[PDB]
Amino acid sequence: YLARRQNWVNQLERHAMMQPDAPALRFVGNTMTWADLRRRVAALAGALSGRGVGFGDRVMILMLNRTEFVESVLAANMIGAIAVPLNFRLTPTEIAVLVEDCVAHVMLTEAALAPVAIGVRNIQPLLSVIVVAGGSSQDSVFGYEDLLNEAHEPVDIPNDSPALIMYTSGTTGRPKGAVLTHANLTGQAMTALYTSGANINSDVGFVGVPLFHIAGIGNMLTGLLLGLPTVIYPLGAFDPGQLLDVLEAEKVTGIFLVPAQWQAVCTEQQARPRDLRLRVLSWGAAPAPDALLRQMSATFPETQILAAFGQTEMSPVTCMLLGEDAIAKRGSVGRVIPTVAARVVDQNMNDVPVGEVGEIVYRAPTLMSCYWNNPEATAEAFAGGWFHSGDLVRMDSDGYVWVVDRKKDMIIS
Amino acid sequence: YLARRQNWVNQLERHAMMQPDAPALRFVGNTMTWADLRRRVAALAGALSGRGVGFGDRVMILMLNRTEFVESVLAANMIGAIAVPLNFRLTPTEIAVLVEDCVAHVMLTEAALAPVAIGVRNIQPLLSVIVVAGGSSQDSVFGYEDLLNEEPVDIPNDSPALIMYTSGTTGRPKGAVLTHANLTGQAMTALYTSGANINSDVGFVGVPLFHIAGIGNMLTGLLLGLPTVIYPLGAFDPGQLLDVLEAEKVTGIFLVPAQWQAVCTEQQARPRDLRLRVLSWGAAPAPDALLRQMSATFPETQILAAFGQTEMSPVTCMLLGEDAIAKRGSVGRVIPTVAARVVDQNMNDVPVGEVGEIVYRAPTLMSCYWNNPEATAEAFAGGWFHSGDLVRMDSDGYVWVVDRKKDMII
């Protein structure tokens, strides 16, 4: 915590000092302690620093859910470089376009995705350093474990330093990458603290969405800040019974699922209960029937149920729906969280009458800095001094936000 | 959020916009909404900068538990001035020493303490401005509500917000400088220990607001836009306190173990309809019996005991209720946002489990003793902050502070 910096690199160091043998990460049944994570991170950082990676440089990450993803984000940040996590379903051309946009020379990937990283290099020769998790040093490619075993001088990381470039998936035209600073991420961890709460002694976190997505990386903030372990769940087919078995075994205390998944988990748990430790349940990314919400409360008594709204690559969580208001204000995305300011404006950035439909626009410390090397798109995003969400909403007399939009029919699509 | 700044002045502006008519402060039965609080704070900031006080200047506050205390702190910080809360038990000579150390020229006081402030000005002519809450604009006195009846500033998160002078004052006064980033980080410790319901919570400050434990109890309410009950200083009355906690639907309160004893006996005898969710104790030892009584008297509540917070230090250790009996006598484990070592006189770690001085590294440590680099260097000797508390740390991480009990008869 030297130089009075707050970021998850310093947090990693504090935990390796104060609780080396405590669990940091759980992945397919193995445990990585803080001393182990710090040791590997510092080794990968040294390998990157030795191969030209310096402050401000960009490091691509092309991985599925696995500990080397967390290790790579932290290693890049430890030397003040910017991690750029990639949607692993992108074509080699799509990734090559992103490599040119932020001019990144290093890509940390894994064996399953190593042919894709090879293809990106052949299309965009700006990528010269490919490090493959679970691979060996061969074929003009470095082996991840080889670089760690081949072994960093402290770097002052101001809290306004960019920590991540999160590229948006709209991909309509020119790519747009949201730049998130450590201060941004710290504020987003704060939002998790005053909505979900925390128990420093017993909580165990869980990330089951893709770690490249802002929802995955965001589920790491609590764990890394508070020194609590985080279960990394591998990506794959959804099995409600096996997930419940894992939640039981790992003693997980908070999980996010989409409403469809909660229905499959609730009926599986009601039929054959597991001994769970869930304290908070989270849902979102689709509507939830009023029957399901009451079914979840009945299936998991003594647990609070939350639903966040607003988080994108550019925006943090802006609205929160606590379990109390899931019935009184059903259909709502909740109220604007106390660390975010919002207006409902019209085409000319004038506030619309209270209760009317307009675009909700935000001001907050947890908004993205900018779109990387794109002053035009950044200027439009913050047109009039407020971040334009693109979401048509309506606020009522009680401050509850309702998002208006036409639903999608899958059979027609 | 002018340039992505995080401080309670910006939070106050945010709350006045998103929920102007929501309760901000509660004092002696009266609600002050966020819109009322912002209007008043802005008027006092205008009155201040009308006296030549600007960025970095020090404004002194000599007040009891009263809404104007919070208005004064926010009004000075709104123009970048540094608020210096004063211990109202100090003699006018002692206060004049503090006026000299930080070279303050403005003192915001109240009618009750206004005799003390004039005495300060008779000892120290640097105090050219004395604004009295609850008083008229008489000779050499500015009326608080009269100055309120009569441009934005960029405030970097590392700007000094407060100067908190220590009580010991062994000859030389020492004023701990706390920045807005410092305060933000201290607010975060409350969130991940006590929790927070951003809909139903109602906070409570009953210790003196000038003390760090008092000003600290405001952080959560101003950050999360939740009401805070301000409790007037005076004779302790467990039944009267219980009646207020019931009427205000207070969700969290701090009390000293002796007060918890009286509150538990009253609440068990004549139970009130309370909404308490978290119970905080500290500043004295709590017997095994009292903690069990508190748990029985208030089921469905969490019991917490913080340690370490001083004018210079944040909270550094937390004892959760599940450990108060397992690890009796402990002050808890070091919190996740604080690094600590137990060292001997050569800055070397003592063997684990052995006694040494606990030293701290954390973003929420004080910046410096105001205008005293000698004391600041001694306090940070070796690269770590020296608490002055001798401790040991067991194999599970729990911290035991070693001391000598103070005998009352002697």
Side-chain angles (χ1 to χ4, degrees), chain B residues 295-340:
Chain B
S295 181
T297 303
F298 309 96
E300 322 290 345
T301 69
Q302 191 180 7
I303 302 179
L304 298 180
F307 173 86
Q309 179 164 68
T310 64
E311 288 81 24
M312 323 90 176
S313 184
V315 179
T316 61
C317 301
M318 273 291 310
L319 186 63
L320 276 49
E322 46 180 3
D323 308 317
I325 294 175
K327 305 280 186 172
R328 265 281 320 283
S330 176
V331 296
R333 290 164 69 245
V334 182
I335 57 168
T337 57
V338 164

Side-chain angles (χ1 to χ4, degrees), chain B residues 187-267:
Chain B
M188 213 168 57
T189 301
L191 300 176
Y192 66 67
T193 58
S194 306
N197 188 313
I198 60 188
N199 282 344
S200 73
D201 267 7
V202 179
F204 179 97
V205 49
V207 302
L209 269 173
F210 73 79
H211 195 266
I212 180 73
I215 209 55
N217 260 317
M218 297 298 310
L219 298 179
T220 275
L222 304 174
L223 181 59
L224 303 182
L226 297 169
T228 314
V229 182
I230 293 163
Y231 204 66
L233 301 161
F236 184 76
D237 186 354
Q240 190 184 231
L241 178 58
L242 275 169
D243 291 340
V244 174
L245 296 174
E246 176 187 59
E248 301 286 336
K249 302 154 187 292
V250 171
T251 54
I253 179 170
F254 168 94
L255 294 170
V256 144
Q259 294 167 311
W260 277 121
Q261 186 55 85
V263 166
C264 285
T265 303
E266 180 69 22
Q267 175 68 356

Side-chain angles (χ1 to χ4, degrees), chain A residues 1-2 4 14-15 18 190 194 198 200-201 226 322 324-325 335-342 363 367-368, chain B residues 1 4 14 18 188 192 196-197 199 224 320 322-323 333 335-338 340 361-363 366-367 380:
Chain A
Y1 275 141
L2 206 48
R4 296 262 168 81
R14 133 81 175 72
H15 302 324
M18 301 296 298
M190 207 166 299
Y194 65 71
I200 312 298
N201 289 353
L226 301 180
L322 311 185
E324 328 167 31
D325 314 324
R335 296 202 297 154
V336 179
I337 63 166
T339 45
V340 164
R363 284 218 209 193
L367 288 164
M368 67 162 183
Chain B
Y1 305 110
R4 297 190 166 96
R14 136 77 172 75
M18 307 299 292
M188 213 168 57
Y192 66 67
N197 188 313
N199 282 344
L224 303 182
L320 276 49
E322 46 180 3
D323 308 317
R333 290 164 69 245
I335 57 168
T337 57
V338 164
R361 261 196 189 163
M366 67 156 182
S367 297
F380 289 100

Side-chain angles (χ1 to χ4, degrees), chain A residues 1-2 10-11 13-20, chain B residues 192 307-308 313-318 331-344 347-354 356-365 382-394 397-401:
Chain A
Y1 275 141
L2 206 48
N10 283 16
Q11 302 156 18
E13 309 267 18
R14 133 81 175 72
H15 302 324
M17 165 187 298
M18 301 296 298
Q19 48 170 22
Chain B
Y192 66 67
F307 173 86
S313 184
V315 179
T316 61
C317 301
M318 273 291 310
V331 296
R333 290 164 69 245
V334 182
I335 57 168
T337 57
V338 164
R341 295 206 296 146
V342 183
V343 310
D344 55 50
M347 214 59 46
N348 293 321
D349 296 0
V350 303
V352 55
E354 301 292 339
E357 176 192 22
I358 191 177
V359 300
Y360 296 121
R361 261 196 189 163
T364 52
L365 287 169
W384 299 71
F385 170 77
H386 288 267
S387 73
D389 302 328
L390 302 175
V391 310
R392 79 169 285 256
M393 205 168 59
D394 68 353
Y398 285 90
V399 179
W400 280 266
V401 176

Side-chain angles (χ1 to χ4, degrees), chain A residues 45-83:
Chain A
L48 293 187
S49 194
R51 289 173 173 78
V53 184
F55 201 98
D57 293 357
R58 272 75 54 195
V59 182
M60 318 287 285
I61 298 155
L62 183 71
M63 297 192 194
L64 304 143
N65 281 14
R66 58 183 298 160
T67 65
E68 291 90 345
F69 181 97
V70 184
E71 295 176 359
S72 302
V73 178
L74 296 173
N77 280 177
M78 169 174 287
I79 63 183
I82 306 168

Side-chain angles (χ1 to χ4, degrees), chain B residues 164-188:
Chain B
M164 306 288 295
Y165 282 99
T166 321
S167 58
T169 53
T170 63
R172 172 81 179 270
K174 290 180 177 52
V177 174
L178 314 179
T179 69
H180 292 287
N182 189 313
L183 296 174
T184 305
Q186 298 212 48
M188 213 168 57

